[PDB]
Design a protein around this ligand. Structure first.
Ligand SMILES: [Cl-]
Ligand SMILES: [Cl-]
Ligand SMILES: [Cl-]
Ligand SMILES: [Cl-]
Ligand SMILES: [K+]
Ligand SMILES: [Mg+2]
Ligand SMILES: [Mg+2]
Ligand SMILES: [Mg+2]
Ligand SMILES: [Mg+2]
Ligand SMILES: [Mg+2]
Ligand SMILES: [Mg+2]
Ligand SMILES: [Mg+2]
Ligand SMILES: [Mg+2]
Ligand SMILES: [Mg+2]
Ligand SMILES: [Mg+2]
Ligand SMILES: [Mg+2]
Ligand SMILES: [Mg+2]
Ligand SMILES: [Mg+2]
Ligand SMILES: [Mg+2]
Ligand SMILES: [Mg+2]
Ligand SMILES: [Mg+2]
Ligand SMILES: [Mg+2]
Ligand SMILES: [Mg+2]
Ligand code: NA
Ligand code: NA
Ligand code: NA
Ligand code: NA
Ligand code: NA
Ligand code: NA
Ligand code: NA
Ligand code: NA
Ligand code: NA
Ligand code: NA
Ligand code: NA
Lengths: 92, 237, 56, 194
RNA sequence: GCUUUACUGCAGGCUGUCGCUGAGGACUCUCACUCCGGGAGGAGGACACCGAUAGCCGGGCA
RNA sequence: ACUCGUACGGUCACUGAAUCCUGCCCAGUGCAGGUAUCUGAACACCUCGUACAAGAGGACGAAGGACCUGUCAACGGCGGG
RNA sequence: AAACAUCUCAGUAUCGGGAGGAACAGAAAACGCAAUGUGAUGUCGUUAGUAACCGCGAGUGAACGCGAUACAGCCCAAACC
């Protein structure tokens, strides 16, 4: 489906309607220093590693919308519920 | 499954051992201080139970009596010599350096003084081709060109008993008698005629190998069976 | 040949005999080892925890 | 001023440099040709020995023991085992090499008792330790106020019961506070959890 | 119990790296180390073996 | 252990006396050889980060794989129109 | 664990080595109710199924302190001779 790159809507920070800019959430890079990372190293040994011997689940036929709505005046973004969309293309 | 036959072998149990106590002598070149003066006289010719080939009994000047890996054409009364200055006649042993290129040789040492390792079976021989101050090039019976220290001793002539392989065994019983004198388990049951538990080719409603017969060099014992690291198979091409 | 009664006839071989060290008829005269006390194998006396129940 | 001993100690802080380095390169050649347990007239590291209790006296013995380097020389399972217990290669013994060395020495001298031991280097495949043993039956020791303690019956086979310095450290008894909940007073009374 | 391109691992083989290990992306040497020789000495040589680790193969086995 | 053995050896497999014979297929799988380029771990090395460290990235690249080739008395195949 | 691989059964069964009448531990490179505080070590009661671990599932599981029992503190190496 199509979606405008910018549009007026409620900003939970400003607490009033303003032009927002929509962007797809780009994945953040992992640091490898989280607790789960240390547990993986710590608990992996001889034989099966329990949960750490598992591999990547799979895929649902269509994913939900994963977007960021950025207020055009205070610059703060907010998140919203996503909805299933085979494809999402922005207009302008 | 169970260990395959090739694995039972290594344990060295009675069934797989050679009847060593029944063997005569460990054929090795005599040790000479130097000078070469060492000579002896052939006193008898005997059968070697470990090689199905003749061997010669020699009485050396300094009283030593030892069996020797006999080349063809050696008889009672003959005088053999061992040393740098040994004459160049069949039955004598001297370093590849003192040997004239183009002469057939047997019982060649791999390392000077090891007593002889190559070309010792019935009727075979090595071929001394090239000389040098550093390397003596010998062609072994397999056809390979081997570079050896010219100091490696050897015996002039071809090993006795040539042609042994020309006669067929004809019957099972004859193989039997020979096998009884070797460190070997015989007869041989085909892998494909066994059960899955006993061999990688075992099992099935009819006889055939489960997978392809060419096995990797890296295969572990118990699995390395069939055509080991075959560069090719069949006859075509 | 039946593995039962008919195969019992060839049993005239002496193996386990009265042991010099413990007195039991367990000294295997072929192995020169007592299966009961360990004589011939161990200076220490043969004994195992599984010869009795675990908590006893 | 600096004791002469301080120089032996200081040299051994870096067994791979200076004169010591060359001695080792020379010595090990002969050591590799010696047996498992070799009684030696004098300690290679005099300072270390005296520091641990050594005395140039009757009934005091020193011996160098060689032990292979590496993990457990272990046989693979011959029956059912869950994956966790199927290892062979990475399993290592819980008793350190120095301790193995002390035991091999004590067995060699059934009548003597281990007092202490120290390292004298290693090559690529084995380590060497010199063990100081004591004759608890010799009067020259039974009358020494510094060593006579080792003559008491309860000190018999001390090395085999982990009463050695290397035994006690390897048992996790070094610390008196945090971390020694499962080691003191013994590994066994704590259920074998350290 | 058995099989395999079932899941997960474990031996074993191959290969890089570190230690043993030294002198002047290809090279010489000798002193450790290895092998041959009764010895003298010869071959090989910082490699190999061995210890540690990493990648690949791995129903041979659990 | 084989081995008091050394290629006329002995190991690993297939077929199963003699006689007449044993065609075509290397795409898949297996084994083996080669390999410009691609891919390919760790140590050491370079950059960033941290007064250190965790960590992220780069350069180099072994065996192996991609790719090419050889091989069926190697596993096996030899149809429809 | 209602299957099962980490986990659990369990450092249990069993095996190897060895002491004593009891063993072992033990005079702080401790504790960390953070203090102007405690003062070797076992053990008992409690702290507490608490903190901590864990396909964060099932399960697993201390310590300091406190109240008791009994109380005990010393010898080398070295400097200088
Ligand atoms: Cl989206
Ligand atoms: Cl034959
Ligand atoms: Cl002791
Ligand atoms: Cl307190
Ligand atoms: K289990
Ligand atoms: Mg693992
Ligand atoms: Mg021989
Ligand atoms: Mg034939
Ligand atoms: Mg036989
Ligand atoms: Mg057959
Ligand atoms: Mg059958
Ligand atoms: Mg099988
Ligand atoms: Mg058939
Ligand atoms: Mg067939
Ligand atoms: Mg029966
Ligand atoms: Mg206790
Ligand atoms: Mg040798
Ligand atoms: Mg299975
Ligand atoms: Mg269950
Ligand atoms: Mg569950
Ligand atoms: Mg537990
Ligand atoms: Mg605490
Ligand atoms: Mg004093
Ligand atoms: Na841990
Ligand atoms: Na089959
Ligand atoms: Na002793
Ligand atoms: Na522990
Ligand atoms: Na069954
Ligand atoms: Na093909
Ligand atoms: Na092919
Ligand atoms: Na259940
Ligand atoms: Na079940
Ligand atoms: Na778990
Ligand atoms: Na209080």
């Amino acid at each position: 489906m199509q979606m405008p790159r910018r549009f007026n809507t409620y900003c939970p920070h400003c607490n009033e309607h303003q032009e927002h800019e929509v962007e797809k959430v780009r994945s953040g890079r992992q640091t490898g220093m989280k607790w789960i990372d240390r547990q993986r190293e710590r608990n992996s040994g001889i034989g099966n590693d329990g949960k750490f011997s598992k591999v990547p689940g799979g895929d649902k036929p269509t994913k939900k919308t994963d977007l960021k709505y950025r207020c055009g005046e205070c610059g703060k973004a907010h998140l919203r519920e996503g909805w299933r969309a085979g494809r999402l293309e922005f207009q302008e | 499954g169970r260990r395959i036959q090739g694995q039972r072998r290594g344990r060295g149990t009675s069934t797989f051992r050679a009847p060593s106590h029944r063997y005569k002598a460990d054929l090795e070149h005599r040790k000479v201080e130097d000078g070469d003066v060492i000579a002896g006289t052939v006193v008898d010719i005997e059968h070697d139970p470990a090689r199905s080939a003749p061997v010669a009994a020699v009485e050396f000047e300094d009283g030593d009596r030892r069996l020797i890996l006999a080349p063809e054409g050696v008889g009672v009364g003959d005088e053999l010599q061992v040393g740098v200055s040994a004459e160049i006649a069949p039955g004598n042993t001297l370093p590849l350096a003192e040997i004239p290129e183009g002469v057939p040789v047997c019982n060649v040492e791999s390392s000077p003084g090891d007593g002889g390792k190559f070309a010792r079976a019935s009727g075979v021989n090595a071929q001394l081709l090239t000389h040098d101050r550093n390397v003596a090039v010998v062609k072994l019976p397999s056809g390979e060109m081997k570079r050896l220290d010219p100091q490696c001793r050897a015996t002039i002539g071809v090993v006795a008993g040539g042609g042994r392989t020309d006669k067929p065994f004809v019957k099972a019983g004859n193989k039997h008698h020979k096998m009884k004198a070797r460190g070997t388990k015989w007869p041989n049951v085909r892998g494909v005629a066994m059960n899955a538990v006993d061999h990688p080719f075992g099992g099935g409603g009819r006889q055939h190998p489960g997978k392809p017969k060419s096995i990797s060099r890296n295969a572990p014992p118990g699995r390395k069976v069939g055509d080991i690291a075959s560069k090719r198979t069949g006859r075509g091409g | 040949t039946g593995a039962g009664t008919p195969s019992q006839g060839k049993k005239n071989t002496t193996t386990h005999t009265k042991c010099r060290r413990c007195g039991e008829k367990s000294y295997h005269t072929k192995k020169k080892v007592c299966s009961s006390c360990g004589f011939g194998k161990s200076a220490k006396r043969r004994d195992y925890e599984w010869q009795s129940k675990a908590g006893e | 001023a600096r004791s002469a001993y301080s120089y032996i100690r200081d040299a051994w802080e870096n067994p791979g440099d200076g004169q010591l380095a060359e001695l080792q390169w020379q010595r090990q050649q002969e050591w590799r040709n010696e047996g498992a347990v070799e009684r030696i007239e004098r300690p290679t590291r005099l300072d270390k020995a005296r520091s641990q209790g050594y005395k140039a006296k009757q009934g005091v013995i020193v011996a160098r023991v060689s032990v292979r380097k590496g993990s457990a020389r272990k046989r693979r399972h011959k029956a059912g085992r869950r994956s966790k217990r199927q290892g062979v290669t990475r399993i290592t013994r819980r008793k350190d090499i120095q301790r193995v060395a002390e035991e091999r020495a004590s067995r060699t001298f059934p009548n003597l008792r281990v007092l202490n031991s120290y390292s004298v280097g290693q090559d690529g495949r084995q380590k060497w330790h010199e063990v100081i043993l004591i004759d608890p039956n010799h009067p020259a020791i039974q009358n020494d106020d510094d060593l006579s303690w080792i003559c008491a019956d309860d000190q018999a086979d001390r090395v085999f019961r982990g009463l050695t310095g290397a035994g006690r450290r390897n048992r996790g008894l070094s610390g008196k506070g945090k971390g020694s909940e499962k080691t003191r007073p013994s590994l066994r009374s704590n259920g074998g959890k350290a």
